[PDB]
Write a structure and sequence with these properties.
alpha/beta, binds magnesium ion, comt, about 220 residues, binds S-adenosylmethionine, Rossmann fold, binds the ligand O=c1c(O)cn(-c2cccc(-c3ccccc3)c2)cc1B(O)O, transferase/transferase inhibitor
Length: about 220
């Protein structure tokens, strides 16, 4: 059943419930992309940057993924749809209302079984990932939360022993608005090997970009 439609997020979800095929992840993604292109802008990674996220996953084939910043569940659906049987996505969202919409988005898209949604701040949840969430290390991290948190969380992930030789970090919005402290760290450190992907801001013609940084080991 539908939500009131009071917030943009409830309206994006209602649109999906009314205008997309249940259990069809592609259909769900197209509906969110269409709604935000035509009706109301929203901070989903979008279809053009979404294709870059697709290719990174398809190249490195992660089994254990971490996403920081869920929102309405667009990238969770996008990433989870490409995962092998037994692969897990952990997605961390601070806002309980978004987390509610994300769970519903994920259920509807048929990727429920792939996703562990955790309500809370990344800095409180990250130190718990091993003991509470049964994580050894991560194959891949998607960073798409507050941009001033990209660097402290990257270091925290390192300090907590969650990064290994070959962990792929992928960061949205390194051009728009930017995360220059994170970008200097990964590019400047011999612990990371970086690739830059120029693209466009979601639903706009503004230039944006993603950075891929593969961890070398400490
Ligand atoms: C750009 S949106 C996420 C978009 C999502 N990755 C997508 O493409 O569909 C940013 C989200 O990050 C969340 N967020 C910001 N800081 C956070 C933190 N420290 N821990 C967990 N979530 C956070 C915000 O509440 C917001 O929902
Ligand atoms: O994930 C995000 C993202 O993908 C884009 N922006 C963002 C920042 C500044 C301007 C604009 C912007 C410009 C022009 C038109 C519309 C939006 C967008 C913010 C977040 B975030 O998590 O805080
Ligand atoms: Mg973004």
């Amino acid at each position: 059943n539908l939500l009131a439609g009071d917030t943009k997020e409830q309206r994006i979800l209602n649109h999906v419930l009314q205008h997309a095929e249940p259990g069809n992840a592609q259909s769900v993604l197209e509906a969110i992309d269409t709604y935000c292109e035509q009706k109301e802008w929203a901070m989903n990674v979008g279809d053009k940057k979404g294709k870059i996220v697709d290719a990174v996953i398809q190249e490195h084939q992660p089994s254990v993924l971490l996403e920081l910043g869920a929102y309405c569940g667009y990238s969770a659906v996008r990433m989870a749809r490409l995962l092998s049987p037994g692969a897990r996505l952990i997605t961390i969202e601070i806002n309980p209302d978004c987390a509610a919409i994300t769970q519903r988005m994920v259920d509807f898209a048929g990727v429920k079984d792939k996703v562990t949604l955790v309500v809370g701040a990344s800095q409180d949840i990250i130190p718990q990932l091993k003991k509470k969430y049964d994580v050894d290390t991560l194959d891949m991290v998607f960073l798409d939360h507050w941009k001033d948190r990209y660097l402290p969380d990257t270091l925290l992930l390192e300090e907590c022993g969650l990064l290994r030789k070959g962990t792929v970090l992928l960061a949205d919005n390194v051009i728009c608005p930017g995360a220059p402290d994170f970008l200097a760290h990964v590019r400047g450190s011999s612990c990371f090997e970086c690739t830059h992907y120029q693209s466009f801001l979601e639903y706009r013609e503004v230039v944006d970009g993603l950075e891929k940084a593969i961890y070398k080991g400490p």
